Write a protein that binds this ligand. Structure first.
Ligand SMILES: [Cl-]
Ligand SMILES: [Cl-]
Length: 517
């Protein structure tokens, strides 16, 4: 009569309370860890760290930077070159009473995009979705708050914000407050040099950050993501009265970049697959039931995927109910094959129903997840990007099974002295992305086996698959099957499929009871 099979949740936690095992070391400022606030944290919210600003190829181009210049065409037809931040202030402190004036204000410092940008999702939310009185509240209450917060960027960010590039193991930690400010800037499309669509541009290996592409999109899932974002700002912006609602803590972003040294040779892993404490659940979610665990983000190589766009599946949804993740887009270069991004601290602000086109904001969430010693909520998320397959069969290539093993490997490494909590994951890169649920569950088990991590796997309503995966773990447990041995069998399946879901699991049966004599 239970939703789950395999080992129990208490067991995934080693019969120790959730949150006793940590997923990241404490924040310390170092050569490889930049921290945007003063350590140790005395006052809350954390006090900003002060150092000389940077306008260069190694750091975020901040909208408030004195180096940021902009041409303005004037009434009289002439050019004035001015400081773009000063133009931004002037635009955003004019009164703004309608959606057309908001767009015109934003365009006034983005004039290149005058006839390319149209904020149709914002027009749809404010002119068609909301009643006259909720729209008046957006322009009299919320938008003024977002502007005031955006304009405090030079007060809240007083040190350079580094980019987390390719092939560099590095961490960045910011206050939730600092992130709210950066995001208010993105909402108002203020980030310089991050708008061009030209193919071989400065930041073309970085995700989008200005919210314009969200505003350009259509359909109800998009309006619902806007509602999540509106709500985030209502939660985290100071009210006219007081700033007591402003979030108190910290978020840490860690780029994991594996060296060739770190690559596992999978045909040498002597790790027994059945020794993995496996908990497979057909109800529940990673974000709810996976507390204390390393929760997986079924990521795009560009962090956040199409969250600022039409995207509304597992990654995008997590980035709008926990919007502080969005700031990763500002500074995180796209993930190479042996890289991952760990995100610890992101507060949840919203509840939701549905998935893809049915996705809806369904109310306020008051996150009471306890904070670590560093002031981070103990919500640890790893972004690992699966491959997409137009052709299902391609994924059975040995090279692309190994690519996925190694992607999940770099995501799931621990590299701490204390022992690792379990991973909370599910159907990674499956459904419409082409991944085989059955294969991807095994790859994830192989990785967890090898690293000595429990695995809580969520099948999101699929009892059938819960059982086939549980059953295969039992078969490995009392056959004492090993990683290198399942790898061997999996390589066999590679060469069989090159001649031509439920079939991957039938052939292991076969290549496994042939051993049983
Ligand atoms: Cl001006
Ligand atoms: Cl610009």
């Amino acid at each position: 009569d239970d939703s789950w099979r395999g080992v129990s949740m208490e067991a995934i936690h080693r019969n120790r309370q959730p949150f006793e095992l940590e997923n990241l070391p404490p924040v310390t400022a170092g050569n490889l860890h930049r921290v945007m606030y003063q350590l140790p944290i005395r006052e809350t919210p954390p006090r900003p760290y002060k150092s000389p600003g940077k306008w260069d190829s190694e750091h975020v181009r901040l909208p408030c930077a004195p180096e940021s210049k902009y041409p303005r065409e004037n009434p009289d037809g002439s050019t004035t070159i001015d400081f773009r931040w000063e133009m931004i202030e002037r635009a955003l402190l004019q009164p703004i009473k309608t959606c057309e004036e908001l767009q015109a204000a934003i365009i006034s410092y983005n004039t290149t995009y005058r006839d390319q940008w149209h904020f149709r999702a914002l027009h749809q939310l404010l002119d068609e979705e909301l009643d006259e009185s909720e729209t008046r509240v957006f322009f009299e209450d919320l938008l003024p708050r977002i502007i005031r917060l955006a304009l405090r960027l030079p007060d809240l960010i007083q040190s350079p914000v580094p980019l987390l590039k390719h092939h560099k193991n590095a961490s960045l930690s910011l206050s939730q407050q600092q992130i709210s400010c950066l995001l208010a800037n993105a909402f108002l499309c203020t980030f310089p040099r991050r708008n061009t669509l030209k193919r071989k541009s400065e930041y073309s290996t970085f995700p989008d950050i200005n919210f314009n592409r969200l505003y350009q999109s259509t359909g109800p899932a998009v309006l619902e993501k806007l509602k999540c974002i509106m709500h985030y700002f209502r939660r985290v912006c100071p009210t006219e009265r007081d700033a007591s609602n402003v979030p108190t803590g910290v978020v840490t972003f860690v780029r994991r970049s594996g060296l060739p040294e770190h690559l596992i040779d999978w045909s040498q892993s002597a790790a027994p697959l059945g020794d993995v404490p496996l908990h497979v659940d057909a109800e529940g979610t990673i974000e709810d039931e996976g507390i204390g665990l390393l929760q997986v983000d079924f990521a795009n190589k560009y962090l956040g995927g199409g969250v600022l766009g039409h995207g509304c599946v597992q990654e995008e949804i997590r980035f709008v109910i926990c919007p502080e993740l969005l700031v990763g887009k500002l500074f995180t270069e796209c993930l190479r094959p042996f890289e991952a991004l760990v995100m610890l601290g992101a507060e949840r602000y919203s509840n939701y129903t549905g998935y893809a086109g049915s996705f809806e904001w369904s109310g306020n969430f008051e996150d009471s997840t306890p904070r670590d010693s560093s002031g981070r909520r103990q919500t640890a998320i790893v972004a690992i990007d699966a491959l997409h397959f137009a052709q299902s069969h391609h994924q059975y290539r040995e090279d692309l099974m190994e690519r996925e093993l190694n992607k999940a490997y770099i995501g799931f490494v621990h590299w701490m002295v204390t022992p690792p909590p379990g991973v909370a994951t599910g159907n990674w890169g499956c459904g419409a992305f082409g991944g085989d649920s059955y294969l991807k569950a095994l790859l994830q088990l192989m990785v967890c086996a090898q690293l000595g991590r429990p695995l809580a796997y969520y099948t999101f309503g699929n009892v059938e698959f819960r059982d086939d995966f549980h059953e295969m773990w039992l078969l490995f447990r009392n056959d004492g099957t090993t990683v290198q041995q399942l790898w061997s069998i999996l390589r066999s399946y590679s060469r069989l499929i090159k001649e031509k879901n439920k079939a991957s699991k039938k052939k292991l049966y076969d290549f496994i009871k042939e051993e049983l004599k």
